[PDB]
Symmetry: D5
Subunit: 188 residues, 10 copies
């Protein structure tokens, strides 16, 4: 994964590229709000991709056991902020996670941490959705997991708004349609 040493070393390279963009756009990088912009844009881009620094394995250290709880757990409206890999323009929305545990439940804070690791990268919504559902499956080994991501893509909102919904259903969520209906009803 990416490190703080890498970030320190690559910051002047990113600032050099951002200053070249300011020049190529027909702007004077030696003006009022454009003086510190090569560095500010570089630091913003490093923050938007800080998920590369994290590994899902080290975060996973919280699979708390449940006593006789064979019931569906849902965490809806988790704020998600990601970067489109095709155009390098943000896409912002919400993630709705649902699962049927098998003696192990994940902490609420840790569920939102999985969303953060994957969303803070150059992404495609379809991949971010599957990554979140696969991490949960591998962390808890549940009966099933359902992930629904609804986001507004700026790369087409700035072009002339429409929401993109992607859903990954695994285990009992994809096989039992009565379980899937319950999940989709409860996330409303």
């Amino acid at each position: 994964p990416r490190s703080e040493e890498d970030n320190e070393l690559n910051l002047p390279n990113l600032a050099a590229a951002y200053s070249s963009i300011l020049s190529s756009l027909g702007e004077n990088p030696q003006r009022q709000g454009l003086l510190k912009t090569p560095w500010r844009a570089a630091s913003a881009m490093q923050f938007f991709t800080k998920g590369y620094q994290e590994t899902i394995s080290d975060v996973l250290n919280d699979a708390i056991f449940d006593e006789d709880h064979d019931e569906m757990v849902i965490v809806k409206d988790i704020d998600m902020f990601s970067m489109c890999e095709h155009h390098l323009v943000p896409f912002v929305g919400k993630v709705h996670i649902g699962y049927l545990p098998n003696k192990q439940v994940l902490g609420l804070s840790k569920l939102a941490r999985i969303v953060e690791i994957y969303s803070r990268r150059l992404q495609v919504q379809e991949r971010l959705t599957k990554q979140i559902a696969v991490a949960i499956t591998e962390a808890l080994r549940p009966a099933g997991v359902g992930v629904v991501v609804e986001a507004t893509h700026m790369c087409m909102v700035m072009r002339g708004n429409s929401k993109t919904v992607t859903s990954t259903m695994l285990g009992v969520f994809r096989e039992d349609p009565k379980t899937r209906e319950e999940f989709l009803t409860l996330i409303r």
Copy 2:
């Protein structure tokens, strides 16, 4: 102003800077969705700053005369999409324009064209608001003009949403408070 010849000439320079950013972020620019990204991001950035190509003077050729109309004209909820100059991150919202004419009214399409010229640039919301109000004042010479811009800045929404409202009041809109009250009530 910027030209299509300039855009053709600077596109490979922008693509060279975007590919360097992909490399500096810890990504392989020779992969699936990252192959055409240096060019796609460069073309998106040229589109987001296409207002530099336009001049407010050539657009201004539509000051249609009015017969005995000394009444307030408002065009509210004009979609506005701009780029923050400090971080190079979008900021998206609406512009509400209002004016009291002096024998000359501007076409609705031309009012939204003023918003487009100024918004499609590296901006500060405060400047974009004043630029829109000054262009209208210089185009129509009215009794007064009021511009209210409400936008969501991604450079702070991606950091953890809050709307930023900036308002420029000129002429009778800044002097007569009864006129200003009417405008702010009608834009709701």
Copy 3:
């Protein structure tokens, strides 16, 4: 003279002929199933959208009911309005909010709606339609004041990529007394 049904009957084939020419000039086949009756359908639709030319404001004015001892503000809000943009021939639809302070003369609700219909069903500019409604009421009732607010969505710019246009005409006490104007704008919300 206003437009008549005899004029409409006589000009319908001329409008259909022009619409058939438009279909061809746009690169369409006017002989295809869906376009066969279109020159006539578009012509009849355009005649309906401009039927306000057939009406006269003076002849609609016939019953100004004498509700004397009424020195209080009357408002008719959310009157549906459908008009045609005179610059591009594209619709613009919205609502008209009318308000007035009578001078021992009130106008019937149906007659206020007929004023909106006469002026809106024409090739218009929102600013003119607003003033025309306001002036018609002033001339019909001779009130203390009248306020007209028109909020409409112009398709000629919504089809180009979405913004309400608000125009307001204040006459008499509505124009002069700001406390009267504040009451009107609050009540139309």
Copy 4:
């Protein structure tokens, strides 16, 4: 397809017909507001039918490939503006697209260009709905596609608002009712 040479050549024909329409309606085409109307209404009509200039095959040449993703992708609330072919009066609304890919996904911007090519023509809502569904099927070869179009027809809004809903279901969207239920729930 229609070209810019065709548009330049047919503009005076359209302006001549529009001038005739102003006269046939009982208007004075020499009055201030109507002077440039034959040309303005001609250029507006050319813009409303600019989809004739575009070809679907040339636009559909950029389909992204994603493996192990047999999950439903939805793009809802896509703004749509079309022309009624029976009366030449607009009909505006939203398009909701949904599909189950077969190792091939379409870019969000390209989905919006399919809606634009077909909607910017003299249409019937039923045809526009099928055209979009077919364009997606041809571009991706997916398991199934669903298109729902909700529009307000100015023909029966200017006559005294009622929404018209048309839906085209293809492949697994048509056959599996559990897939169709999920799509219709998610577009709400």
Copy 5:
């Protein structure tokens, strides 16, 4: 004298006879199942809609503004005999005399259940409260949907009567109009 139950009994066959004539004049068959009891049902409905004629208003340091908003109102248009329904918002500044909430609602019912003009219904309620309490001021706002124009293709008519301090002090009027929202 106000209308009585003796008059309602005596005039019911007259109203039923007129409604029988209306069904025929409209091109309907008054002998069909759904129209058989209609001359009597319409007559009794019209008597109920105008039952306010039977009633008489004469029968029906804590000085702070009192407001009773969203009082349901159902009246009949006197020009076309078509209903108009809405809400009444009443406000007043007392002078050591307040009115019961049920009695304020009875004033609205007495005047609304008659052949009306919205402007008159608004003034009649404001005058009744002024005469009952002798307050510093009273404000009445009526917002109604007239079916005689909604059935013709079109939403709300607002009429307001301001008396006393409500009419004179604009700061009092602003407070009232803000609070009824």
Copy 6:
């Protein structure tokens, strides 16, 4: 059907009956506000029952189109204004029509004319709902048709508000419950 000759001949009869009603209610028909009421009420009642003048048979010509579409078409929120046949008091609301065509479609304006023909009469909501559904079935011969009418009855709103919903399901709408579920979901 009723004619304009009949309306001219019966207007004084209706005015005579309305004048008698004013007297029977204890009003003075000579007062300013009631003088023209016998004629105004008579003309209003003739307008509310103008559907008697129209014939359903004279509406099918130059209305039925040919689609080649087996997909569901819905026209929701059609404003409906009718008169209660029991008390002669209005009942106003919305009609939602849906159908699965069989190589025959119906123009949107003609669907609205079916609602107007039947609603502008002395009605019972149950009958108005069935009459619309039968008219569409006879005009198009479709796979199925569904009609839902939701109206507020003034004859009980004036007595102390409550919406009445009546639904007629024919063909595949009546038999296939999965089709009926889709229709009822889409009209929301």
Copy 7:
């Protein structure tokens, strides 16, 4: 036999006497201005809230599902004598017999204006409709806010009675529950 106006006249002083005792037992002064007429006013209000006892239900190819939703309901909790207000949604599939809208509302009024349990009020209305029309099925849904627990710090209690085809056919029940939304 049902309650009569003779019983309302005879029992009013008994109820007023009991309400006089309640004011004193609560620690109030029944002679203060606001409480003077309260023993009689509370007694008459309680008689009105239970006026359904006076009424008797026995007195009060177009076979498609008919629904009357959002019928206003105002009842009294029989456990604590505290009101509970809400809405009744009625639905039925007729068998060549339909009921007038006003008569459906009168069924709700007869049973709601009594000392009730929501579960019973729901079943009584469903049974009355079944006995009046003999339909294919009937569905009654009552959603009410109980003041006896809202005044204690807490929003809606939903009770549903499904009879005939509404109980048996789940596709019919789904349609009804969808349409009442």
Copy 8:
């Protein structure tokens, strides 16, 4: 004030009166649902009037803070549940309190206890509003205080819904209209 000893002693008296009410209404007090009702109603009525047990004077200690703030403090949407003194029927709603302090502030919990003391009694909304405003004035000696109570009276909602708004303005709230406007705007 009323005590727990008084409540214990008067509970059988209230139960006796409630049993008499059940009989006077034509009910059988021996039926299952009514058996414990004389005691349940008695305990409910004692709870609804528990404000008699409290004293306003015993609430000011360990409650008044010292701020050095001359800015307006507002506590809106305080749930209020009271009993009509004319009919013994509840009236429920919200209290909105506002004040301009004079070097003396009041704890949020103690403001809510003032509302509870006065509301839990046989009341008239006008009195409850003034009693709260006077209690705050006497506790803090502020520049001004404003109390707005909006409640639904069941004694008229059960008769056929309508909100009653009462407002008491004291000090600068009564005198300065610009202060009163700010308060009424902020409580919305």
Copy 9:
């Protein structure tokens, strides 16, 4: 044994002592005006937030009203719930939706609310609070089935940067019959 008022009186100074230590460990001055009574105020607030320990589910169960001939679903939705996160000692507030199909035994509305209060006023995990409410109702009424849905906002993650947590326990016919479960989830909306 459950917690008592004698226990609360005895442990209040111990809780106040611990809270005073927390103020110091956080870098605050416990002698400043606003913090003087805080060790006692926080201690009393924490005792109130955990007052459910003082209650017993068996003793609250005393009136299972015999509403026989009721083979229909009873729902009590939007019951306000306020609880304490056992992991971080931070509140989590929301609503509880309860539903059940009785077997000639119904529970009073007030008693259903008392079950929610007993379990919620403790150091909890939403999953446990949901199952505890469900099991208490099953044991009190022996019904055909019971459904409990709890939707709450956890401050321990809203204060960290905003998401509702929904937990549902389905027992008996609610768990087995999917048509019953669909009806319950539709009616709680």
Copy 10:
């Protein structure tokens, strides 16, 4: 200010006190769910009061300069999460900031950092409101500043929701009532 060395040193003290609180409340600190709670509640409390670690002077070193802009800037709906200093229970809401600059504007991210430094401390809403207003005044030296804070206090939400509104007006916001009216209208 507080440091990371202080946090490391005081964590076992806080954990020891939290372990004592679990015992004093009648809980078994050895049960699964409570085992790591002394440390988790200690770290949560340290996060809720991390504003003590920050200094306002070090953050306020980046104020942008804009000339000829004497127009009002507003940042509304800034999420705020604070701790009640009387009971140590959270209070969450929104901050609405407004100001009239004097050739000096503050970055949107820096306005949000002022809210964070002061809100992440044991507070009283009245103080937090004044602190933010003062921090802006000191950083920009503007014509005037307005701060409105709306929060829900868990002290009186867990006890039986009412919002608390506090407003601090400085400079022209305090003196000119027409400026104050505009600000309060725009934050709605």
